[PDB]
């Protein structure tokens, strides 16, 4: 009597989770609203920790990540670097070693395509936009109603459907602010420049490495791309007014609008913004900071990834946090599956809820700390004090807070998470 | 071009290894001398620690195992029990709690079958009995010559070919005694009886549990099989004689032969043997104890499983040791593959040699410890002093050591082993 999971959302997280459930023999379907791939071209990076979590899910996920990424002498180490972006000094401020393969990078859309090829045929159903969830009794199945009029029936449901998750709206009600993300009152300009232009502006050292330029109420990050032939610029600025409601979270923008937010900043940084194309993009930064979930699960329904805890991206690890969710959910459902072989329907369904109950108990604190921490480190990158020449030593003490908060993300003990998860599941079963 | 690995031997360790390596993108071939009747219908059991290693090699390995056993209101803990076999007292002497699914049991032939279905097509080559190995410069492929006159060319070679390993003889020499196992001067009778007989003879509590009966110079172990409808008997006895040269290691025997080794034992136990069939098998027990490998590896050849370290089966975990081998070799070769990806053929082949070097450094002590330990616990099960009631405190005092040695096996820290093996690989490359 096999265990059927309906995953709503075929993004990175829903697909990584599907891979882990299917390699363990659980019947999975992924319902994806789109009709093919998306996020076509962007870089993403995973901590060495998240990569090990991927490997426990199915080692093939890690082959997929490396298939989708990028001479003699030694092996390179991975460094976060911060640079002073306001003053003319533009002095190197801090640096953090993450180690050999401390981060592993890939093209999102090509990683996700590699992932889908790892799953059996028939796992992913496209053009299934979940509209309504119907919950009957715990011993009965959960019905998913899609916008095309088809239904589907599954023993349990997982929301992997992103920052605007419909599973979240079902749990907390389509009219709750808890069901929607909200503006962080910051937005970002993104564009590319040639590697030649980046060296003029910054020097060769700075142009061929990831650097965050800090400053008052704004900050700018760049790193090389396309075999070091170009450099990506992402520049983050403060917005006082509400993000217009019903207004799209992307939209075109102009090089010169970017430049106006950095006019008082040092000259290498301004030359970089000027080297961008005339037309570039503006991305609002939303998250679940203001109305975080009261619970990641209830009954036979569970939230994972951005659906549970969308973050602003100032740690560059939001998916990693979702990869832990997917490990923890995959391990619990295998324990449900082995530990209820041959028991009655009543027993199998209370196991499912008991496990989801443990998932929430185990994940919600780290996940919702990470959402807070993302806003926090962004604050520290944009302190007004960076501009005060009397306060650039109070301001330069944030780097210990960044190291500790970084390390707390990178050195997650996922094995103790899995051990505590199994204990809480047994506990929750009167065992 | 991917790293290629020729595994000699399609037993449980060689096929587990292959699964772990292909799931990571390494191009594998398994060469098995046998036609494809494969394993015996006997049963084996795996510690929860070995099962976690299985998961990390490939989660479908554990699925192959749980689907290759039977199906078991609260959850059953796994206990090992020792009883006095030599007096009619039949007193329960000791008990080790191994926890929920502390062991996971299967049928060997059903597992190896499931495992091979997991593998991609085109991996296991049957009727390929290795005869010679031709090594050349580190930078060249290794040539495997088979008895059908055919050849194969692999970047590196693993010996998964068992207690009579041919890869072992190439390393140490056909006429070296390090190339061969040797007799442990004990052998086992094996056969089945009904649960009805077993209850009638031992009583229901013992008949339906695993118990070991200790006594002088022999011991007996029984456990339910075939979904508690029968009981398997394994009776071990001592043999002062040598085992005849090239006499086969299995042989037919009689319930009456086995009964005479236990004539002085307690009644219920002699009744168990009387209930066996009239014809039963006699299993000689050889190991690598007298002449243990001086090294598991050399150049681009590496031994694993029973080839490296076969043992007498008195911890019932010798294939667990092999799965650790398999995980360590798999994690190392995966590290060779990512870290030498776009480098010269010299670096890649040196990296293999450095990985096989690390394997030997981190595995040999624990596995040669285990071989010795297997003989040692048998000597404690078979103390002459079990016979003398005045020496009872001394005899029973043995179980602390059994506890220590069992916990050393079951609590293996495979995460530190792997980190140790990665550090040693990097040190061996010159870093
Ligand atoms: C600029 C930026 C840079 C980032 N860089 C990194 C990084 O380097 N490393 C890292 O770890 N994280 C990074 N993150 C965070 C990371 O991208 C996200 O955490 C990750 O995409 C979340 O995965 P997901 O599957 O939960 O959500 P999504 O990617 O949003 O997938 C949700 C899926 O569900 C579908 N869907 C939505 N609604 C429905 C519905 N009703 N019915 C059916 N399907 C539905 C959607 O089409 C989509 O396929 C970054 C984020 C941003 C914004
Ligand atoms: C009675 C008994 C009970 C046991 N119970 C347990 C248990 O409960 N739990 C546990 O973990 N372990 C147990 N063990 C130990 C376990 O069975 C062994 O450790 C394990 O079988 C070794 O696996 P392997 O793949 O290295 O060797 P093998 O299983 O011996 O496979 C070796 C393969 O290589 C093939 N081969 C040999 N030579 C060549 C050649 N030249 N060319 C090509 N192929 C070749 C062979 O035909 C064979 O298929 C038990 C052992 C015994 C005797
Ligand atoms: Cl992020
Ligand atoms: Cl054994």
Length of chain A (residues): 431
For residue B180, give the nearest of B99, B252, B243 by alpha carbon: B243
Say whether A58 and B415 touch across the interface (CB within 8 A): no
- Cβ(A49)–Cβ(A42) below 8 Å: no
**Contact status of A24 with chain B (Cβ, < 8 Å):** yes
- Cβ(A50)–Cβ(A323) below 8 Å: yes
For residue B282, give the nearest of B261, B263, B268, B264 by alpha carbon: B261
The structure's method of determination equals X-ray
User: Tokens in use for B325?
Assistant: 């081998």
Which structural domain range is residue A216 located in? 1-431
Residue B20: partners with Cβ closer than 8 Å, 6 or more residues away: A59, B57, B58, B61, B326, B327, B330
Atom of ligand 1 nearest to the CA of A131: 41
Q: Which helix (H) or strand (E) holds B213?
A: strand B211-214
Residue B145: partners with Cβ closer than 8 Å, 6 or more residues away: B130, B131, B132, B133, B134, B151
- Cβ(A370)–Cβ(A376) below 8 Å: no
Atom of ligand 2 nearest to the CA of B13: 25
- Cα-based distances in Å from A405 to A370, B5, B238: 9, 42, 63
**Contact status of A264 with chain B (Cβ, < 8 Å):** no
Question: DSSP for B346-365?
Answer: HHHHHHHHHHHHHHHHHHHH
Domain count, chain A: 1
Say whether B23 and A63 touch across the interface (CB within 8 A): yes
Q: Give this entry's resolution in angstroms.
A: 2.3
- Cα-based distances in Å from A124 to A22, A118, A152, B144: 12, 11, 13, 43
Residues A263 and A257: their CA atoms lie apart, in Å, by 10
Residues B347 and B220: their CA atoms lie apart, in Å, by 53
Distance B314 CA to ligand 4 centre (A): 6
Q: How many CB atoms lie within 10 A of CB B100?
A: 16
Residue A173 backbone dihedrals phi, psi, to 5 degrees: 95, 130
- Ligand number nearest CA of B285 is 2
A8 ligand 1 Cβ < 6 A: yes
CB-CB neighbors (< 8 A) of B60 in chain A:
23-25
The alpha carbon of residue B329 is apart from the nearest alpha carbon of chain A, in Å, by 15
Question: DSSP for A58-111?
Answer: -THHHHHHHHT----S---EEEEEEEE-SSTT--EEEEEEEEETSEEEEEHHHH
**Contact status of B101 with chain A (Cβ, < 8 Å):** yes
């Amino acid at each position: 009597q096999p265990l059927s999971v309906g995953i709503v959302g075929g993004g990175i997280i829903g697909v990584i989770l599907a891979a882990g459930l299917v390699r363990r023999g659980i019947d999975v379907k992924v319902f994806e609203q789109a009709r093919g791939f998306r996020e076509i071209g962007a870089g993403m990076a995973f901590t060495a920790n998240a990569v090990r979590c991927m490997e426990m899910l199915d080692p093939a996920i890690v082959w997929a990540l490396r298939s989708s990424g990028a001479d003699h002498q030694a092996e390179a180490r991975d460094y976060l670097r911060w640079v002073d972006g306001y003053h003319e000094s533009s002095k190197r401020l801090y640096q953090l070693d993450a180690g050999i393969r401390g981060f592993e990078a890939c093209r999102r859309d090509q990683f996700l395509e590699a992932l889908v090829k790892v799953l059996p045929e028939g796992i992913v159903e496209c053009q299934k936009r979940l509209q309504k969830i119907h919950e009957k009794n715990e011993t009965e199945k959960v019905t998913l109603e899609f916008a095309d009029g088809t239904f589907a029936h599954v023993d349990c449901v997982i929301g992997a459907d992103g920052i605007r998750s419909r599973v979240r709206q079902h749990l907390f009600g389509e009219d709750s602010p808890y069901s929607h993300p909200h503006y962080s009152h910051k937005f970002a300009f993104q564009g590319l420049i040639t590697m030649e232009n980046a060296i003029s502006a910054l020097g060769e050292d700075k142009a061929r490495t990831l650097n965050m330029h800090v400053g008052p109420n704004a900050h700018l990050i760049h790193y090389p791309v396309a075999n070091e032939t170009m450099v990506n610029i992402a520049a983050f600025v403060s917005d006082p007014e509400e993000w217009p409601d019903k207004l799209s979270l992307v939209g075109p923008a102009t090089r010169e609008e970017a430049m106006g937010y950095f006019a008082n900043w040092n000259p290498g940084l301004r030359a970089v913004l000027g080297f961008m194309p005339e037309n570039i993009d503006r991305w609002a930064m939303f998250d679940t900071y203001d109305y975080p979930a009261p619970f990641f699960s209830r009954g036979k329904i569970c939230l994972v990834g951005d659906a549970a805890h969308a973050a602003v991206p100032h740690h560059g690890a939001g998916a990693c946090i979702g990869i832990e969710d997917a490990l923890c959910a995959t391990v619990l459902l295998a324990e449900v599956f082995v530990s209820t072989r041959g028991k009655s329907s009543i027993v199998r369904n209370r196991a499912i809820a008991a496990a989801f109950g443990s998932f929430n108990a185990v994940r919600r604190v780290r996940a919702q700390w990470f959402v807070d921490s993302s806003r926090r480190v962004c604050d520290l990158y944009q302190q007004p004090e960076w501009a005060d020449p009397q306060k650039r030593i109070k301001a330069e003490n944030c780097f210990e807070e960044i190291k500790d908060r970084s390390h707390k993300i990178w050195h997650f003990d996922y094995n103790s998470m899995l051990q505590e998860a199994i204990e809480k599941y047994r506990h929750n079963m009167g065992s």
